[PDB]
């Protein structure tokens, strides 16, 4: 698991936060993840140790990689131009898992980022610090 939300996980990429969890997506619909701007090709880091469980297109989120951390915690990384890991692999905190792209069809390169606890996307920011 990711443990208490204490700023101990790695930021997946560093850049300006373009959209925050819960912010307006379209009308009164809300984002259920963050969007962090970064140059095309920047490495995306696994935030914590885990198992890669998905590495495929998911409509609305371009190419997504999903890492399970155990005990009901997961992290999701979308809009990537490519994945650097395959489903089934174990990854380490900080390890490169994808490269930033525009596969979500966005206006500029950026990472789509979710943390799901007990199967539900929640604000990821409080875990991020390293
Ligand atoms: Cl898409």
List the one residue out of 76, 45, 44, 41 whose CA is nearest residue 61: 76
The number of CA neighbours under 13 Å toward the Cβ of 80 is: 26
Domain 1-130, classified CATH 3.40.50.2300, yes or no: no
- Identify the experimental approach: X-ray
Ion ligand 1: residues, CB within 5 A, are: 62, 104
Q: Which residue has the tokens 């990689």?
A: 65
* Residue 71 CB coordination number (10 Å): 10
List the one residue out of 88, 115, 85 whose CA is nearest residue 99: 85
CA distance 123 to 34: 8
Measured in angstroms, the resolution is 1.6
Calculate how far, in angstroms, residue 104's C-alpha sits from the geometric centre of ligand 1.
4
Q: Per DSSP, which regions of 1-130 are E strands?
A: 17-19, 24-26, 29-30, 34-37, 43-45, 50-57, 63-70, 73-83, 90-91, 96-100, 110-117, 120-122
Burial class (CB in 10 A: 0-12, 13-18, 19+), 76: buried
């Amino acid at each position: 698991g990711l443990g208490a939300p204490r700023g101990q996980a790695f930021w997946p990429v560093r850049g300006p936060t373009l959209h925050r969890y819960g912010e307006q997506l379209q009308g009164e619909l809300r984002w259920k993840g963050m969007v962090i701007g970064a140059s095309e090709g920047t490495e995306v880091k696994a935030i914590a140790d885990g198992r890669v469980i998905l590495a495929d297109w998911l409509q609305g989120y371009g190419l997504v990689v999903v890492v399970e951390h155990g005990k009901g915690d997961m992290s999701l990384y979308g809009y990537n131009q490519s994945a650097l890991v395959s489903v089934g692999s174990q990854v380490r905190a900080g390890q490169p898992i994808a490269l930033v792209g525009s596969s979500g069809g966005q206006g500029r390169p950026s990472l789509y980022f979710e943390i799901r606890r007990q199967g539900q996307a929640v604000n990821p920011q409080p875990w991020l610090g390293r």
